[PDB]
Design a protein around this ligand. Sequence first.
Ligand code: NI
Length: 53
Amino acid sequence: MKKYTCTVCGYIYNPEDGDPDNGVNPGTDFKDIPDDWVCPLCGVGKDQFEEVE
Ligand code: NI
């Protein structure tokens, strides 16, 4: 699974770590994160995140 970066603040979503405190368990594909989830650091939505190739 790919990392994704918040292009407003630079936060790196790492699948292998997830975001457990907001309910996204380790092992979760960015695409499967609930679409109401917001960047933990800056609060913007998935739509500002870009795949890291
Ligand atoms: Ni952010």
